[PDB]
């Protein structure tokens, strides 16, 4: 099948064929809106291993975000503080641009639930993403229990709490000795160890 040939040929992103497609498709994506509906995924293999199943109730959105840092919104660079916090242009915004891309399509299509997302194309001004969303009200999803777990109301707005694939990365949630400050969540393991525990019979 074309599963493996598409998997390998996408990896050669500087070959003479793909930089042709990367330069044609970057023109098309500027001419549309910031958020607009993709009728079908442009990368079908990469969509499919993330969980896309071509049936009724899986919606692909295409989104455009700004490249660059984050400039602090204080007026005229006057931070009013100890002479550290004067830094303005070097500030870097702890969430990635990928999770910012998931929130704009999330706040637009609010009935939909955002499943995952992936990279497509980039430019000096904009990065481009293509986001897979799931419809929880559609009857093909409320049945067939591979996917009825998303209709559970604890999965409301996964993209905004940081539970997606790039959400759990940016929080720094993996196993290991490196991730001590963030293994059970950062502010949970802060409050755990900055707490004076006092039993009845004092130890």
């Amino acid at each position: 099948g074309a599963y493996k040939y598409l998997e390998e040929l996408q990896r050669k992103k500087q070959s003479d064929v793909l930089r042709f497609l990367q330069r044609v498709r970057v023109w098309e994506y500027r001419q549309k809106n910031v958020i607009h509906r993709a009728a079908r995924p442009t990368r079908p293999d990469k969509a499919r291993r993330l969980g896309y199943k071509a049936k009724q109730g899986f919606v692909i959105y295409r989104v455009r975000v700004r490249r660059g840092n984050r400039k602090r919104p204080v007026p005229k660079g006057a931070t009013y503080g100890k002479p550290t916090n004067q830094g303005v242009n070097e500030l870097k915004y702890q969430r990635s641009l990928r999770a910012t891309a998931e929130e704009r399509v999330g706040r637009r299509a609010a009935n939909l639930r955002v499943l995952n997302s992936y990279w497509v194309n980039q430019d000096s001004t904009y990065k481009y993403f293509e986001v897979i969303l799931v419809d929880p009200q559609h009857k093909a999803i409320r049945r067939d229990a591979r996917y009825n777990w998303i209709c559970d109301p604890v999965h409301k707005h996964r993209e905004a709490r940081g539970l997606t694939a790039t959400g759990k990365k940016s929080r720094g949630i993996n196993k290991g000795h490196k991730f001590n400050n963030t293994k059970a969540g950062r502010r949970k393991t802060w409050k755990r160890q900055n707490t004076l525990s006092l039993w009845r019979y004092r130890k």
Partner: protein
């Protein structure tokens, strides 16, 4: 026909205890894209038709290189819309034919000799040139007038 064929089998199964030899062997085009690519690389295909316009172009571009490798006589037909009509879909994007009836055998081998003369034989020198030198006609008249004057 399948809604006709199953009850035609079902009367044969209970009455005659037949092993579904009541249904003959089928011959039809094999049409799914992951199914055509699996029929190639086993050398099980006779002709592979390729639609030229596919909206994610990256899907199909390895097929003229893969059909040259395993030795299957590919063709690049025009239209994914035409290929859907012969196989009862809207769009098809490939159509491959494994087998053919024996009375129709000589008609196939004549057709393959015309197709390979255009596509599989030209494949050695298709790779050595680049397309896209066309310009707009206002720009095309601009340089032809100058080159005539120069």
């Amino acid at each position: 026909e399948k809604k006709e064929r199953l009850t035609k089998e079902a009367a044969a199964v209970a009455e005659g205890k037949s092993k579904q030899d009541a249904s003959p062997k089928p011959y039809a085009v094999k049409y799914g894209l992951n199914h055509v690519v699996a029929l190639i690389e086993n050398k099980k295909a006779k002709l592979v038709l390729i639609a030229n316009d596919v909206d994610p172009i990256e899907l199909v571009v390895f097929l003229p290189a893969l059909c040259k490798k395993m030795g299957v006589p590919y063709a690049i037909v025009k239209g994914k819309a035409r290929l859907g009509t012969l196989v009862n879909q809207k769009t098809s994007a490939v159509a491959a034919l494994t087998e053919v009836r024996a009375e129709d055998e000589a008609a196939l081998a004549k057709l393959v000799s015309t197709i390979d003369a255009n596509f599989a034989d030209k494949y050695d020198e298709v790779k050595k040139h680049w397309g896209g030198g066309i310009l707009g006609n206002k720009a095309q008249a601009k340089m032809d007038k100058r080159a005539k004057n120069s």
